[PDB]
Amino acid sequence: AIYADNSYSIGNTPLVRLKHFGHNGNVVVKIEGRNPSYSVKCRIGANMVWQAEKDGTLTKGKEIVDATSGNTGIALAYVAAARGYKITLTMPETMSLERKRLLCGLGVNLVLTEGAKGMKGAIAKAEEIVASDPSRYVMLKQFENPANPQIHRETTGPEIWKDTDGKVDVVVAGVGTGGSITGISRAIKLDFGKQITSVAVEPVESPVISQTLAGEEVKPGPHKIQGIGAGFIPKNLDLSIIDRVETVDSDTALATARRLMAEEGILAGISSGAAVAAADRLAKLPEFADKLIVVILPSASERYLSTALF
Amino acid sequence: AIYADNSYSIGNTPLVRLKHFGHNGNVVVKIEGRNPSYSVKCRIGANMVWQAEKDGTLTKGKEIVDATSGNTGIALAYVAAARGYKITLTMPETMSLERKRLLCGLGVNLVLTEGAKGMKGAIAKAEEIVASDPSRYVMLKQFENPANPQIHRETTGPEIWKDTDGKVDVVVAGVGTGGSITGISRAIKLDFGKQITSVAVEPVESPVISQTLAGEEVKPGPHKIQGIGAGFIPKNLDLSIIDRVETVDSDTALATARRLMAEEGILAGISSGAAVAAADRLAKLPEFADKLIVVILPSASERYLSTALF
């Protein structure tokens, strides 16, 4: 029917079967680029705002404040515009002019912090702003807010169930906040009762989930897979529902995203390439031959125009 | 369920009710940016290829050749990648580096023509290529190919009918090829039998439909509303089903698109602003007060990052 604002238009994203990956069509992708603001983080922008409203922490006149380097800022920006909230986002001054223009265009009050301080500096400044009038400001905290995996339990997971008629056997998802793999997994395992294999994907350059689960020193490192590999275990990653962790390198992520574009006609982001590369490895193991593998593509590639992708 | 390739994922785009335009919620937008390749022209890229296959003009091994300055080239490029066709697109060398990179990334053979010749030069070169081996090449010709409005009759129109439960009274659409207003209108008027008002939108700078229908000299002119105002009456515009023509200026198109972003949280292209501006004019006339106005937003704005929009 007719959505009351664009926040309600999230999800119902398509599944497409891959032709040049997997073995006999065993790899299927969920195109979260096919969403408002071009990414999966429209679902959490919407639901974190919605839950804050229901719980009375976000009310008429209060202002959203958060620190955002990626897609959640774009998501919160469109949700705040659609629902009529002022919003201030902090981010380092190093951010691209194009991102700043997009955010400015969405009506955000942009507070640029010192370049040297990176994300710690922006998170600091956001917290500082909230401290300055905690009755005025609400910080939604995507790495810890349960409304993040909750929306994936209510929407993303049930969409995979329904569109595969319950035949999904494996879910492959890169982990940034962990919300996607957590909610999807809880839906399918707990609410639909199917003992699928849930596969976290992280960069080989920063394999903190693998290291954690091995009892090894956690050694984060730099990499180019935007949106994943935060270098710590976020509160919104439920390690209990993770069955396997696959590591992917940045070069192969990129190369895989390029192949999705050139060979499948799917315009997805670098982290989409990382997820597909991990899924293709599993898909070519005889143990996964008769299994339906659903892979989350978090974002679209026209958002990666000025990046190593293109 | 699961699409066999990304060509089949077209459409089922959302309707969102506007909060800061119209009068008591009478203006609703159809967000065709929520499509593969970010625009409405994924529907015609898909169906022109599909029809050419069914009619035996496009077969295994034959190459798509066309001349494209806008969104249809991006559409044909993703469809050709998804379905496994080679494709050559011609376009003037003046085109943006970003568009060229996108198209190169989609696997297109890009043939850049002389800048001075603009689109006539590219259309020439495409025709020249087809002439060089007409058994090898297929040019799909979006301004004349009936498969363009046919896909809108089969999909876009029926989606508006269903999502409004038949209550749509007015369709407002900018005209580039005319396919969208033609097919949508034929669907609703002919197949569902409702005598709605079909409104073409064109630039005030190049009001060739208005001039034509007035019996006046046709005087095209330059403007900035990308995707509409081709400066002629295309074969795919069925003037018989047009009830009214509204003209919109480029500055107000832009300003309207900016307002959609800032005030509604909808990221749409300049021609989306032109369509909304025309629809808002109609919506504030007492004759349209009790009428449901559905407005087509052809494309998304992250494709308009480096443009007057941002």
UniProtKB/Swiss-Prot annotation, chains A, B:
Keyword Transferase appears in the UniProt entry: yes
Subunit record text: Homodimer.
Positions of modified residues (N6-(pyridoxal phosphate)lysine): 41
Keywords: Allosteric enzyme, Amino-acid biosynthesis, Cysteine biosynthesis, Pyridoxal phosphate, Transferase
Protein name as it appears in the record: Cysteine synthase
Pfam families (UniProt xref): PALP
GO BP of this protein: cysteine biosynthetic process from serine
Positions annotated to bind pyridoxal 5'-phosphate: 71, 176-180, 271
EC number, as in UniProt: 2.5.1.47
Pathway as given in its UniProt record: Amino-acid biosynthesis; L-cysteine biosynthesis; L-cysteine from L-serine: step 2/2
A single GO molecular function term of this UniProt record: L-cysteine desulfhydrase activity
Organism: Haemophilus influenzae (strain ATCC 51907 / DSM 11121 / KW20 / Rd)
Reaction(s) the record says it catalyses: O-acetyl-L-serine + hydrogen sulfide = L-cysteine + acetate
Enzyme class name: transferase
Family: Belongs to the cysteine synthase/cystathionine beta-synthase family.
GO cellular component, one term: cytoplasm
Xref: PROSITE patterns: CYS_SYNTHASE
Keyword Transferase in record: yes
Cofactor(s) needed: pyridoxal 5'-phosphate
Classification via PANTHER family: CYSTATHIONINE BETA-SYNTHASE
